[PDB]
Amino acid sequence: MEMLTKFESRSSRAKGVAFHPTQPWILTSLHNGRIQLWDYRMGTLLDRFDGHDGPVRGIAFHPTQPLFVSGGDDYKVNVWNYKSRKLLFSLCGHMDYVRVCTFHHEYPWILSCSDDQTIRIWNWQSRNCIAILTGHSHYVMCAAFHPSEDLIVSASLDQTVRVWDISGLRMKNATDAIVKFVLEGHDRGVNWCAFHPTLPLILSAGDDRLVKLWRMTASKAWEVDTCRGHFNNVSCCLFHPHQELILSASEDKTIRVWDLNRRTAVQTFRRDNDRFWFITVHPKLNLFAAAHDSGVMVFKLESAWSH
């Protein structure tokens, strides 16, 4: 496959990137504490948001509301309105770095996870923490809401991937969270976990340099296969929403594309000098973004020799 670069931002180290679901924007959250809002069609910096001290790893738009959420090494989960360009409030409660923060697609919830070994669920309408998910015994590096079921997946340096049943919390308001699966397969800490948008699949990746693929039903899960080949920590991994492809990004300075059905290597992209910290895909368009030591890139994936 070939990478068609649409936009590149040169900066100090970038940690997170989020696509707006309908506008041609990305948010980038930087190691230096600042958040940039870029139009990647025009190549223009639309706005800058400074509300954190130290690196900002979590960053996400709300799917429909004019809001985004950011999560920092200062332990704060910040909620912003990008049309008024205001910091609306901070959600405080975590006692160590916030690694990820996202919005739920239907309920008025924000999910965050932290080096304090907890996942928190907050109601952004009430500004209250509505659930603290405990049980991991080391940093929680990633957490994600399932797109259709009342489930959360989380990944921790305790070498486990957890699937949590939050139907109890759903019923009480749009036993609250029960651990459903404790997935055991990784031999070292796990840095990332991801759901597939329409298939019952999970991806996990971590310091063992492995990307593991899992499948599940309501009643059970199974390890399907492993993508092997990265030669340093894997920072991030994701499913291509519309093609039978897996993507991963690593401190070995590569982004790797893998066959979903065979888990064989399809294509590797390298940078001579830059470790990769994060990758994301647009929910609808053939559009990817990657954060690395020198900034952010937005690219299209094409089959080799197709243009």
Q: How far from 131 is each of 162, 164, 278, 306, CA to CA, in Å?
A: 16, 12, 27, 49
Q: How far from 79 is each of 4, 60, 69, 108, 301, CA to CA, in Å?
A: 33, 10, 5, 13, 32
Contacts of 86 (CB under 8 A, 6+ apart): 80
What single letter denotes the amino acid at residue 227?
C
Beta-bridge partner residues of 299 = 5, 288
Experimental method of this PDB entry: X-ray
Beta-bridge partner residues of 3 = 301
Is the separation of the CB atoms in 192 and 230 below 8 Å?
A: no
| 88's tokens | 């609306």
Edge-to-edge strand ranges of the sheet holding 128-133: 98-103, 109-114, 119-123, 128-133
**Start-to-end C-alpha separation, the chain:** 11
What is the Cα–Cα distance from 85 to 107, expressed in whole angstroms?
A: 24
What is the Cα–Cα distance from 213 to 227, expressed in whole angstroms?
A: 8
Give the residue among 68, 31, 15, 76 at the shortest CA–CA distance from 51: 76
What is the Cα–Cα distance from 277 to 59, expressed in whole angstroms?
A: 13
Q: Give φ, ψ of 249 to 5 degrees.
A: -140, 145
Edge-to-edge strand ranges of the sheet holding 190-195: 190-195, 201-206, 211-216, 221-227
Question: Given the DSSP bridges, would you call strands 211-216 and 221-227 parallel, antiparallel or unpaired?
Answer: antiparallel
Buried (b) or exposed (e) across 238-268, using 16+ Cβ within 10 A? bbbbeeebbbbbbbbbbbbbbebeebeebbe
What single letter denotes the amino acid at residue 90?
S
CA torsion angle 174 177 180 186 (round to 10): 110
C-alpha angle 238-240-241 in degrees, rounded to nearest 5:
115
What is the Cα–Cα distance from 170 to 162, expressed in whole angstroms?
A: 19
The residue with tokens 């919830």 is 109
Largest CA distance in the chain: 55
What is the Cα–Cα distance from 282 to 242, expressed in whole angstroms?
A: 11
What secondary structure letter does DSSP report for 297?
E
Contacts of 79 (CB under 8 A, 6+ apart): 67, 68, 69, 87, 88, 89, 90, 91, 110, 124
The residue with tokens 């973004």 is 289
Give the residue among 270, 227, 222 at the shortest CA–CA distance from 246: 227
DSSP 224-275: EEEE---SS-EEEEEE-SSSSEEEEEETTSEEEEEETTT--EEEEEE-SS--
Give the residue among 179, 195, 182, 184 at the shortest CA–CA distance from 133: 179
Q: Give φ, ψ of 20 to 5 degrees.
A: -70, 135
Is the Cα torsion angle 77, 198, 38, 305 positive or negative in sign? Answer: positive
Burial class (CB in 10 A: 0-12, 13-18, 19+), 10: exposed
Question: Given the DSSP bridges, would you call strands 276-281 and 86-91 parallel, antiparallel or unpaired?
Answer: unpaired
Entry resolution (Å): 1.8
